[PDB]
Amino acid sequence: GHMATVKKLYFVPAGRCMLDHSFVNSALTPGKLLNVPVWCYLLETEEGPILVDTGMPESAVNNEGLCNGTFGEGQILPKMTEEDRIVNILKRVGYEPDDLLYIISSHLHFDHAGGNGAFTNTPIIVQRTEYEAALHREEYMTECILPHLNYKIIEGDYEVVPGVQLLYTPGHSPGHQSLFIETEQSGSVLLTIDASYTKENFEDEVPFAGFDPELALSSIKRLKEVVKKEKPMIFFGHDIEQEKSCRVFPEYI
Numbered sequence: 508g509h510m511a512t513v514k515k516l517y518f519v520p521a522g523r524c525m526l527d528h529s530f531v532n533s534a535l536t537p538g539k540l541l542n543v544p545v546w547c548y549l550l551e552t553e554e555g556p557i558l559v560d561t562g563m564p565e566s567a568v569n570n571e572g573l574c575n576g577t578f579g580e581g582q583i584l585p586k587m588t589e590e591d592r593i594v595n596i597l598k599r600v601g602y603e604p605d606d607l608l609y610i611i612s613s614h615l616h617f618d619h620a621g622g623n624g625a626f627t628n629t630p631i632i633v634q635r636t637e638y639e640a641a642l643h644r645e646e647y648m649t650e651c652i653l654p655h656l657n658y659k660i661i662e663g664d665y666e667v668v669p670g671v672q673l674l675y676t677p678g679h680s681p682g683h684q685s686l687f688i689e690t691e692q693s694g695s696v697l698l699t700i701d702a703s704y705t706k707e708n709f710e711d712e713v714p715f716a717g718f719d720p721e722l723a724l725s726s727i728k729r730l731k732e733v734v735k736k737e738k739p740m741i742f743f744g745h746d747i748e749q750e751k752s753c754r755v756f757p758e759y760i
């Protein structure tokens with residue numbers, strides 16, 4: 508109870524998503540799709556296992572056309588098989604939903620909270636501003652904001668357990684949050700999540716898809732201050748190049 512660090516941080520592939528390249532660089536003219544990774548993260552901690560995000564909804568399985576009839580039509584195409592349903596991922600890894608200590612929702616976009624309905628008992632940690640936006644903004648799916656789950660609504664920065672900190676990073680979505688994790692093997696790790704899809708969104712401040720790009724920039728600024736102080740390893744949300752060098756399950760950091 509001694510532990511200031513998490514035992515293991517796993518990067519867990521949870522399917523993929525086609526995004527128009529204008530999502531990763533808002534200046535690009537639409538018309539080329541990128542097959543970007545979708546992630547969830549598994550933390551093995553002294554208090555129990557913690558899952559960060561829950562993949563895509565069952566409606567996306569074998570259904571690349573999910574975003575027909577919406578703003579995302581032809582620009583967002585989920586790449587999800589039956590194997591990528593979060594319960595299946597978890598079962599292969601070694602867990603059932605009720606085994607988890609917490610779920611952390613970085614935000615409620617379909618590629619992060621599609622699986623939330625699987626977890627009916629586990630507290631789901633989500634920002635108030637994200638929860639309230641999800642009750643109306645139309646980039647949100649029904650599946651991402653089911654009414655009777657055990658939500659643990661928080662406001663701003665928050666310590667989940669020792670070694671697991673949430674950093675409020677709104678802009679990509681109204682209540683987006685990133686993670687700062689201290690691991691036994693690696694020390695300080697910053698999971699930007701979608702506060703930057705790619706390394707150039709972060710380092711070069713290349714604009715990318717978001718609810719409020721001005722806020723997204725300030726959140727990036729704030730992360731840069733944390734980086735200056737902590738010098739962490741930094742992992743981006745939907746980065747095909749960085750993915751190439753990521754250690755992924757069963758490897759951990």
Ligand SMILES: [Zn+2]
Binds near residue numbers: 616680
């Ligand atoms: Zn998102």
Ligand SMILES: [Zn+2]
Binds near residue numbers: 616618619701744745
């Ligand atoms: Zn995302």
